[PDB]
Design a protein around this ligand. Structure first.
Ligand SMILES: CC(=O)c1c(C)c2cnc(Nc3ccc(N4CCNCC4)cn3)nc2n(C2CCCC2)c1=O
Ligand SMILES: [Ca+2]
Lengths: 244, 282
């Protein structure tokens, strides 16, 4: 019931931003998403990712659960081979694992199975992800960068709550899409922010004005930044529950 | 599964118990074994355990000197029974508790006091700068190696903090809880420093400072010492009484961690730089 309020230590310390970027360099580069796969396509992924998204959204889980569900799922689908009649399970086990870490009230098995395989059969599909990833579960989420970026960009604090709520919502959806899976979490975030800023100016400066800065903050070129915005702004638009 | 043999039980941790044991395939040296009996109810691996490993794994490529190390997770699934877990860490000789209990008179040397404090804050700094709050900081969780080095242990209540995230109103053990938690308020990192305030003191006076029994009493106990603050700070008695044998700069630091308002309470980073510490590693 209580929520995490602003904490200068965790939010305004420049070296926090500094370490996100660093720990971003830990999970290495998917040269191509789901290459190891010899059955399920990326199309299957978009579908399972919107089911997993809907799950998180409708049960109102903390915003950082889904991105991490995605990250687990992906990491996991190199280490092992997935199937079509089995993805539902796997994705279900990612949300279940993600919820266990990043949210106080985690998605229960009975909640997850009943909606969707036996609950025994799901417990294994957890075990099997855990040991496959060798319990190294956590990850830098595109989410994690939101406030550290608002702070770095000198955005007034009273805007943080809305800005947070709004751009986390758009990042989360964007993540559903194939091509977004390849971008660095810092960038996905910078994109999320700018798109959001664009639609209802929120009484900041306008989108334009933050492009050169995020390029300085993150240490990419401006073109890269301008691109990732369009890219994430796209990913958002392509959300569609009918595909289910 | 069969690389070990348990000796003494060095304490009942997060879910069950933690044993002292030796590794065989290695140099023959010591390993810390956490036994986790997963209830064949229906929730999968315990929340607390999954989280705690994930955080420790996540930071391990930093190899921070003031944090415990995890080597392995056994897992052996049983079709004849429930699962059981072997969680395997570096062994450390004793905790702060036993050490405070064993130390010759007249207690721990002030220069050790300063150093343990230092290391402790240092490990904390680290943890916070990676957005981890170790919200279960107590003498039993603080580990002292043979060379007298500090390791933060039991990460089963630690979690990565993000704005607007949901919180359990129920964190830290009674004695070392902060007013914000007691008041059922929202909380974060300053929580760890409150604990370090309490611990700092427990070092000089080899006895816990705030020994409550209810939350309400636990709060009064605190307020009996630190004093009632203003309307501003709500969302005495001179300390030296409760903490004799403390230096003037040790005091200022100690108050700075034991600030009622959290947003006023000092941070590890600024605490690491407080004038109490100049004398140390230099
Ligand atoms: C899983 C952990 O993080 C962990 C580890 C790695 C650790 C290692 N060495 C310890 N070494 C110890 C710990 C305690 C003692 N004393 C033994 C005699 N009685 C009091 C404690 C001696 N050696 N203790 C450890 N703990 C204890 C903290 C609470 C319960 C376990 C831990 O959680
Ligand atoms: Ca929740």
């Amino acid at each position: 019931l209580n929520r995490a309020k602003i904490d200068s230590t965790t939010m305004k310390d420049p070296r926090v931003l500094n370490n996100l970027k660093l720990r971003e360099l830990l999970l290495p580069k998917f040269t191509s998403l789901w290459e190891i796969q010899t059955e399920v396509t990326v199309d299957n992924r978009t579908i399972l990712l919107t089911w997993m998204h809907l799950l998180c959204e409708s049960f109102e889980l903390d915003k950082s659960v889904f991105p991490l569900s995605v990250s687990i799922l992906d990491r996991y689908l190199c280490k092992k081979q997935g199937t079509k009649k089995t993805l539902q399970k796997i994705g279900a086990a990612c949300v279940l694992i993600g919820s266990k870490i990043r949210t106080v009230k985690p998605m229960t098995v009975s909640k997850l199975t009943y909606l969707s395989f036996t609950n025994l059969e799901l417990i294994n599909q957890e075990k099997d992800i855990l040991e496959a990833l060798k319990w190294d579960t956590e990850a830098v989420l595109a989410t994690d960068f939101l406030i550290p970026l608002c702070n770095a960009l000198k955005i007034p604090e009273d805007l943080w709550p809305q800005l947070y709520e709004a751009a986390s919502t758009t990042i989360c959806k964007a993540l559903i899409q194939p091509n977004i899976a390849l971008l660095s979490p810092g960038l996905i975030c910078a994109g999320g922010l700018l798109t959001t800023i664009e639609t209802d100016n929120t009484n900041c400066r306008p989108w334009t004005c933050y492009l050169e800065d995020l390029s300085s903050i993150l240490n990419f070129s401006t073109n890269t930044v301008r691109t990732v915005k369009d890219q994430v702004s796209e990913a958002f638009s392509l959300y569609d529950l009918e595909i289910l | 599964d069969q690389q070990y043999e348990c000796v003494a039980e060095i304490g009942e941790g997060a879910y069950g118990k933690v044993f002292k044991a030796r590794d065989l395939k290695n140099g023959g040296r010591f390993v810390a074994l956490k036994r986790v009996r997963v209830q064949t109810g229906e929730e999968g691996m315990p929340l607390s355990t999954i989280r705690e490993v994930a955080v420790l794994r996540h930071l391990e490529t930093f190899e921070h000197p003031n944090v415990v190390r995890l080597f392995d997770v056994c897992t052996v699934s049983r079709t004849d029974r429930e699962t059981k877990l072997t969680l395997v860490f570096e062994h450390v000789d004793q905790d702060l508790t036993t050490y405070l209990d064993k130390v010759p008179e007249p207690g721990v040397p002030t220069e050790t006091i300063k150093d343990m404090m230092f290391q402790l804050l240092r490990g904390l700094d680290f943890l916070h700068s990676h957005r981890v709050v170790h919200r279960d900081l107590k003498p039993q969780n603080i580990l002292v190696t043979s060379s007298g080095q500090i390791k933060l242990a039991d990460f089963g209540l630690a979690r990565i903090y993000s704005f607007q995230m949901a919180l359990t109103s129920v964190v830290v053990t009674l004695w070392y809880r902060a007013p914000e938690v007691l008041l059922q308020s929202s909380y974060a990192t300053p929580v760890d420093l409150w604990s370090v305030g309490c611990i700092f003191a427990e070092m000089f006076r080899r006895k816990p400072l705030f020994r409550g029994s209810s939350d309400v009493d636990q709060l009064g106990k605190i307020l009996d010492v630190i004093g009632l603050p203003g309307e501003e700070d709500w969302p005495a008695q001179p300390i030296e009484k409760f903490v004799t044998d403390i230096d003037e700069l040790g005091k200022d630091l100690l108050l700075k961690c034991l600030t009622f308002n959290p947003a006023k309470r000092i941070s590890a980073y600024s605490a690491l730089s407080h004038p109490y510490f100049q004398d140390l590693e230099r």
